[model samples]
Target chain A: AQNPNCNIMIFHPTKEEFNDFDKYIAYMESQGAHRAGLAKIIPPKEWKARETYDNISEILIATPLQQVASGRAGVFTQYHKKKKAMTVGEYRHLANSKKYQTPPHQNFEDLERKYWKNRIYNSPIYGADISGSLFDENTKQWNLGHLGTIQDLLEKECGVVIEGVNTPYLYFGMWKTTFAWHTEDMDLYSINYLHLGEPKTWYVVPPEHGQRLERLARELFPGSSRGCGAFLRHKVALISPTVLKENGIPFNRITQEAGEFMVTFPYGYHAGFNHGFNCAEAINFATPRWIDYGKMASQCSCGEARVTFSMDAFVRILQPERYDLWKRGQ
Target chain B: AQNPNCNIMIFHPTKEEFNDFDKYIAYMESQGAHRAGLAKIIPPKEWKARETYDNISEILIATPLQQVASGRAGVFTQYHKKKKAMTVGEYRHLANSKKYQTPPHQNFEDLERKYWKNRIYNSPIYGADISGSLFDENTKQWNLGHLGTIQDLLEKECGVVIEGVNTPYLYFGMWKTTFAWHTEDMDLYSINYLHLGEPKTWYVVPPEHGQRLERLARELFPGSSRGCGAFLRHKVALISPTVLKENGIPFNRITQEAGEFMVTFPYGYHAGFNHGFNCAEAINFATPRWIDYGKMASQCSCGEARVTFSMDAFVRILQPERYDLWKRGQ
Candidate 1:
């Protein structure tokens, strides 16, 4: 069932290349890295950032814990409405406990009955802006906030701050914690930076195959698709790479590690899980090329999937000022 | 009511620049020529082509002759359904007759009763392919069919020849001959080369003002607008530059003479008339940038406005092969 050919493109960028974020991305995109939906970048060895959440015990956060014994996918569903509000320290302790981890020899039924664990995953840490807290004030080279390409050009040009979009959000994940397949908000490009954590496994479908993934999702979850034009945006559907391959959908898998960056192209559908406990900061961004996708996103038939900001206004503001950049093919 | 600020970009390209059609367009587009909807390009003085229709007298064709002094715009309407099938010789002789021409002191009523004439205009010279007829076999440079940018890349890449799109259509025009304001098929870019003719006056509105033009059309022709999401496509609506300016729509006027080229950008609305007898060849084209506009055109709400070709299939075919060209921003 495995597709061995589905290998994601990975880049080990030099310090100079990493420093010039926009140029490096343009180069990688030109090289067809975007054909894989998402590409992983390992920054130079000398690149470093301070751990913002050093004292995890003092920080309390709300997180969803999926019931493992239920035998269903680890996706948000009406049946499992339980959310655990706990300090990061307590969650970390529970996640690392050997008793909670399944034994290698145990069968699924036996593991469910004897050692079922409800793991905390994808919990967003509020009030923690990684740019201000993690990076040293003087060493802002790879800071997600200031990276030329990843930072929202619309916000910079139009002075419109879209909350949870331009501003980065940090999420904590445990083993088997899943994020259902979905495109970024407004179909914009997104960059995820793993500051300090275990590897995160990502499965991405290229932009061209976006419709195929949607069709497969609708086939798998007919009930969810009934009332929604963009059913996947509900973030309650998970399909394995095996099933996707069986259905003839091309995809790529990547294991993103600490100090690495995973950049997703516009309209690329991606879903993934953490190998273990990890904290990653991610944010949506746009280049001149994104205006078309932004318009397409806003014009979606599904009202719920429409973007908040006016794409028309943003395009008007961006086009005149960035004519040179667009002419250069950025 | 004239908007003096709305001036179309006109380029007198060097032979080198003219030879590199796509690069010159990219440069002019970068300089905001597209903002005015259409730009005029005068090729280097030495650039020349053979007169394809040297024996216009022998050629017979069908042409619509609008009833002037009827106090109506020269748009094709239901009432004026008369078409004249005549030899070019007969039409030219009548058009040049002194008695048929309006006198300098004649008023509208006097001209209508005495000297009013129906001029032959926008008549397609069927079966004439300018590339084969006009350009010398060895000197194919700037040939409408051979121009790298204007020649449909889809036909070259996919082997699908879209008649009247990739193939140049020669049009014959006389004094007061008018073309109603409309965008090119599928909102694609179009290039018109005056093979041999007097200057043709063109009125164009930028792509950004497309919706404004549409709104104005709907307001001016409410009956025609009903049930048609793309009413202008019918090619039976004409509004003056003064009216458009008074309605707050920005537009530009350009007079294209013999051996000159007029290029229209995607979604640019254009309408124009001939000063006198002329022959011009026009064809639609697209670069990688047109893919977005093509998609938008096909997804129009009105079925009648949809494109004939599959934009999705074209993109899938074009993207991989032209990745470098797209990356270079054309």
Candidate 2:
């Protein structure tokens, strides 16, 4: 009876519980929600969804879509094959068109060709910097930037802002569109909110098994590993949960719906695909405890990717007095 | 007053104590001999020297001798400038010749030019592999191969022999010839026995300060560090003890005479110069504790030099039962 919806922990928080996000998250963490690397957070039913935002429709974005040749069936191997740019409205229109549909009761070969023809896996809208564009003063609480409350502690203490990490980016996905298995930059925690539309299914492996997952990936893709030590950052390979289970690695499957959030822990390796057209927003964050993980991440042999920020500077700014004491001890 | 022969621990063992070499070394280690990163072991008066061995005279060896251009005063900067090959007898002849002398009662400029003209720093005869050629069974105890008895534990357990590490190599040095700062391959312990020579001056920094020493070397030689992460292994740069002292680094100095041994601990940063014509033999060894150091050494980012041996293979072979348990646990 194992299915795509099984195994993951889901939380349905009351409006009162949801208001104090940091306390609720700490409670969830205490209950071992982080053991699975990711968990679903469903806001109170009374709260209105933020999908009614108007600026999203006019936002022009570019994505490297995966274009499959028209001769494959039940073959869902993703590759980097095409680059496409269009307005969000135009993409939504094309997605709703009849040409993108696969009719029922067709021959296997015909269905396969139709499936290939309709495939338009778009890349993530990673650099949209939509914090200012999508949210104004009136609806600021729902903004992705303000969602992760713990991250603000870094800014409150240091008075330093880290872009991409401290801000948010939007993503647009169609059926079978994927994000390959990877960890967040500098091994930081991340929160992804499915703003609206179709559900996104996610697969996650716990931080303790991150190295094992990497070893399995290196075994599965030797060429990529040979090219770079941090090849997983390229986001090119997608592995199935069944294969991972066969290798004795634990994984959690989660289906995130509209108005829900998915929180990923530090060093968590995760990947997933969309069921259909959808919009999601995600941004990285760090708690005080993340300093140790940040130090470990700095030591990792990233073949070419430079570290985004200096942990030493962050720690110094965060606690100048303590840092001076530690400096003298050194 | 602190001088070139201060701070380093020196052990003078009687003939009976020297006969049980491993036991003597263990006792010395128990007495905190390794705290300084290096120690001097002087042999008993009754034990004869092995310099009279006949085979060494005819052994032809190649060395990259350092040559200095004339016109420098009281300056000692070593560089790679010459390569030469000659028999042991020929080098000895050239070293003993009066032309290679700095005469007294001359002006500073004339003395400096004469010093440069007489300087010929020969490279270590690292590949001589003279263990079999230099020692007969009657004279084997004084041989470098049979000296460090603990290294035999590896061969006894693994049945694998590593060259340059398990075997001994000869070194020939004349007045002012130098060996720049470096640690042994894989951070293993090393033993150097001066068979016949004037005193050799050695400066050593303990294993705890190894990283600090490397940082200083990198700061002093930024171009080399930029060119390669493991640039210290090149043995090109030489920094004086005064410079190290000024930087608040702890150091110990020892002047090793003929018939004595210089033992370096794992990861000990050491450099030295010969006072006059001499011949010495040295080899690397590892105890059970060296496995951890070997692991650390493997993780070190050596930009271009390939690892000399497979640590995984060694660990597996050395303790199959323990390794199997560890493998299953992983």
Candidate 3:
């Protein structure tokens, strides 16, 4: 950003560099990240974004590692009762079992007509370890070394175990699919790995300038909620980097190709568009520096309160001896 | 409030009692709060507001604890450059020494013709110790048994020195003079004692329902900033408790009489206006229950950011010995 208070950075690491994941994490902290790409792990050619849905060979597609199970892509879409059940396994069956053909009906005008979208939810857990059967064989082994595993260390140090902390998830998207502007859960750091497909384009605002973006958004869309919750539902206001710059809220931009990974820093507000069909993996993590925010995550509405934890219990368990380890950046 | 999820309370203390300040604090926690009033601890007769301005007053009024000198009393008013400096001493000189005269210019309109207003600032301290030039002799010794004097216990238990945390400030208001909706700093508890004058009417929304009020305000005034920044200016929209109730957002009401004291709980959003003319004193305090909110306060924009503090630094300085005392409700 041209402004003095903005601090958004993007990093590019060699393909093999993340094998020592801890060092990669350390490198990200030093860089003060928004977006970073790991360029070695390539996606299958079939997973590319095409000009149209019918532009590819007719064959079985890749089994998604994670499932959202929602009919719509935007974060703020209203819930709709579907004939399909709410469970992850049932949604997966409905999504993959339905084959593409001529329109389900003529003159369909919604996002469903323009694109095929189904959020499959296998489990909230990022891994297959909880019940093992919760994840397919291909997905069970995929979460190794991802940020979710760090929760074990946090759980061990505090000597208080917490459920639902170790699960990593998946994203499957096709052309024009999107997620509206939002920060990560509880201001936690998030790493997104694009396993394969067309590159996803991202627009990111640094943590310090988050309020600035919120102000600008409210100014332009007076009737919308703080994050433009209503405006985002139909993709009505797609704020480009140029638009943000026009308002003097600078934004860093990046495009992630197959085999690349992107890292978003704490409190970074981000939104993105998938160039084509693709599969990506993401997980949440925190370092000792995140303690203050972790405490706040349990307090603020900004974290999308899907999960709840005992903040008092968390602090009470931070015994002095363990706090000493915290001071040493353990 | 009648709304089940809302918890805004009003308390009326006895004429000359609050000997058990801790119990008062405990009572407020049990009820939750936005505001309340003490019925009596009557100020000396000299401080009472008479029907007219020139009712046997002294040569000079006491210097105020805070100054908010304005050209007009309404929220919207242009400021003027004073030949005299902007201070409690100077404002008092201009306000009372002018023979209690009328400035009812021929072309004056609305509230401008009713009265004159000037806020004076002497010093911030409310205690007799720490060099008590801060309050008038009547108000000075009055702090002895008031809730404002309990910070020594808090300081002793926490061992964390905070500037301005213990000082009680004054609010002097003429008819229509106002304070816009706001939460106390860091969600600290506050006590407001109406020293003497016409009663003040408060419009209060509980912290839990604060977001609900905000949503309603934004919807009603689409162009205003969050917390109704622009809408509040010029009193463009004075939302009544009835209107809030109409929307199913319950709020509590209280008209503070002379000598009454009101307590505001942590995170409660409150705003009010003096019915005619009044002098009110307010001070803040914190307990261990406030730790979570204090941490969230620095992170969320819910509390305005006129000042900044390190939640981390404060937490780090919280030694176990002191923390244990804090945990024990010192």
Candidate 4:
């Protein structure tokens, strides 16, 4: 079942081609990502050096949702001296607030310097989602050096402002910062472009084995495996490849470098850790084929409240254009 | 895992090539039939005819095993007047023996007349396996008109007389003579040839779904479904294509004619019925890849007690010759 040709389809398209928003989305859907397959693209040019992403990070420092922090200890780290910290966007407002200012004694300058240093080196983890208000500081929006993003086309045709699909959730992570083993929200496809990073080491369970792992988890956590809490909340029980292999579950491993894109298909369970302090951009989107999974995702824990766009709404909007296309063919 | 490409591979090899003995065997193994996947060879020319077979039936009057009978009701049939009868080989010998004569009533001539007339006209069912000592009145064995069967190669190389693999179990069936869904003994591969007569309609489940169907069987037969008895034994509860489709299991259908070879892969679950009165030949064999399946087969069901040849013994006998071949290469 882990036949690489069928499971993880990697394409080396020119950056220009991959960046053509609608076309890339069309191509990935045609390759059947919605039916359980991962696709990765190696962009043509190497515009993903560390210095390039530091500039993007410097620009998005003002948005509230764009930046986030890992306030908890590393999943693997047991004994830590200090608790991790998160830097909120309105540092100046907090420091200057009359009611809160003098209590902690730290000011905006102190918080800003600490976060800026953390961006270059690892104290704990700090990353940001440069999703909203991409044009606040920059002249143009998050371009991806190309256009026709899902947000662009949908917002134009459907007339709904989308916060999820079109927005690039930017991240800057140091070594040991990690994402837990989980599927994409609502079981939709996810594209993560490593704009600048050392590398991200990934372990992916094939879509079929995702159920097997779930069953294994059910066996391990017989009491709590009923609801989607473990899957929805990213409450992962670290199951290694050795254990999966013994039970006949197949998986794949890949270490993604800068300028490469990491794609995750619906239902594929993936987890990874950053190798060094680096920056990346990602977003979730749906194609026509993604309708079923999108529906599933909407109901899939936090997804209804936090999804980028509605597949149901998208289809209802797309139907008129589809009929127009058909009529034109007629 | 509904990859049509890997499940059933049909080939239309030139008659001259497919008719060759050892070469065809080599070709099929190379096609990876032994490792996984069902392969079929439909020879170039059309040779199936009811008239063509009536003559062959008249000629082979006294082989130990060749014809066959289902002795069971077709799944769709409502009611029948006669109980279906399966003919065991050495029927004449058993009936005519001093210990057994007069009990079954006047032996060989009674049998010969009944069967000879039955071949031309259908009773309940008709078919037989012309196995063992393919020698006719003349010493030459029954040939598929060419050479290198797996059985032939193994027997010659290992100096072992194989009662299982080489012996062709020929079948002649009329309408409604059905074989139940089952895998080959010990999970080895099987090749069936429709030498003459009408086509056979087949319904096949890929090896993987056999497990899925087994699971479905467990759902349908919860408490009693353990120990694989329901799957290995002919205790099927008639799950239809609609039910399978509803449960997301995939299967295939084919109507195979004469001059065509039907091969079933290891662990593939297959069931079929003769369209009309037809003459077919079938045999079982194992390749290098078959060792694992062969071992699994011995442990599969009532395999160990009823197997034709032991895989362990075959390997033990085969290793010395393999060393010789290696030495010859050296």
| DockQ category of candidate 4 | incorrect
Q: Candidate 4, residues B199-275: lDDT per residue as tens digits?
A: 67776777756677667656754544464453434323344444567788667666787767777777777766555
> What is the two-chain DockQ of model 3?
0.01
Calculate model 4's interface RMSD in Å.
35.9
Per-residue alpha-carbon lDDT of candidate 1 for residues B1-330, written as tens digits (9 for 90 to 100):
222344688889887777776788788877777778898888888777652445445333334454322223322332234465555566556555563332343443332222113333223222121221234324445666445432235544444321111335556565555676889866788888887755677889878778888888888777778856676775656776657777998787777888888999899999876655667777777876676676565222344433322232333333445323322331
Fnat per candidate: 0.00, 0.00, 0.00, 0.00
Off by over 4 Å in 4: A1-5, A25-36, A46-51, A54-165, A226-230, A233-237, A297-330, B1-330
What are the per-residue Cα lDDT tens digits for candidate 4 across A58-165? 222222221223222221111122322233223223323553222231643343233223422333333444332211112122243222334334444434432212
Task: Report, to 2 decimal places, the DockQ of model 4.
Answer: 0.00
Model 4: reference contacts kept, as a fraction: 0.00
lDDT, candidates in the order shown: 0.59, 0.59, 0.43, 0.47
Worst 10 residues of 3 chain A by lDDT: A125-134
lDDT tens readout by residue for model 2, B37-107: 89899878877644354445544444436544222222234555545656677877776667543245354
**lDDT, candidate 3, B152-209, per-residue tens:** 3334455432211134455545444445566665556666666555567776776666
lDDT of 1 by residue, A1-330 (tens): 122243467888888887777788788777777777798888888777653446434233334455322223332332224565555566666666674332353443332222113333223222122221233334556676444432236544444321111334566666555666889866888888886666677889978778888888787777778867676765556776657778898887767888888999989999876655777777677776776776565222344433322332333333445323322331
Could you tell me the lDDT of residue B253 within candidate 4? 60
State the RMSD for candidate 2: 24.8
Sorting all predicted structures by lDDT, with the top scorer first, yields 2, 1, 4, 3
The model with the greater lDDT, 1 or 3, is 1
True contacts kept of 2: 0.00
Enumerate clash totals for all models, in the order shown.
0, 0, 17, 19
Error of 4 at A212 (Å): 2.3
